[PDB]
Amino acid sequence: VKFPIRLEGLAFSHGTFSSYEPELFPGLIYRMVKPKIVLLIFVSGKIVLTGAKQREEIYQAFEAIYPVLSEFRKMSGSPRNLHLLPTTDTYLSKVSDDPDNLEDVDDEELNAHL
DNA sequence: TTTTCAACATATATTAGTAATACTTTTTCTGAAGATAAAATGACTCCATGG
């Protein structure tokens, strides 16, 4: 997010959905059930997000929680559209789903990988 | 020489999927004086044979 984040009050507020342990690991652990993703948090605002099977769920959680990020700040802005890029199944379809299509997608380098 | 850097690296935590092994647990599951008595003491007697 390119701005600092105060975690000590973050979990102290959201620790129902969050956890913060100074000893083990520097940042904060966040638990979101809706959708179900764990959000790994730091001081600088660099946020690592996983525990998701779906690309859309990422921007879902990141989106919904970003107002919590703007909530806790010390002294971008516009989400634009919630979903911009094509869905996941589009890029899954960009590759042949048929189990028997291989030699067509064979890189020809695997012919050299023997 | 010493100090600051740096730097290298490596855990550290998440979320998975396995799969397999090893490893701890847990949960069965058994292998003070004067009555009261108990017994040893002893006499009594039934009852044995024999001259």
UniProtKB/Swiss-Prot annotation:
Sequence repeats lie at residues 1-69. Coiled coil: none annotated. It is found in: Nucleus. It comes from the Eukaryota. General transcription factor that functions at the core of the DNA-binding general transcription factor complex TFIID. Binding of TFIID to a promoter (with or without TATA element) is the initial step in preinitiation complex (PIC) formation. TFIID plays a key role in the regulation of gene expression by RNA polymerase II through different activities such as transcription activator interaction, core promoter recognition and selectivity, TFIIA and TFIIB interaction, chromatin modification (histone acetylation by TAF1), facilitation of DNA opening and initiation of transcription. Belongs to the TBP family. Binds DNA as monomer. The 1.2 MDa TFIID complex is composed of TATA binding protein (TBP) and the 14 TBP-associated factors. One copy of each TAF1, TAF2, TAF3, TAF7, TAF8, TAF11, TAF13, two copies of each TAF4, TAF5, TAF6, TAF9, TAF10, TAF12, and three copies of TAF14. Interacts with TFC8. This is TATA-box-binding protein. It comes from Saccharomyces cerevisiae (strain ATCC 204508 / S288c) (Baker's yeast). The gene is SPT15. The chain holds residues 166 to 240 of 240 of the full protein.
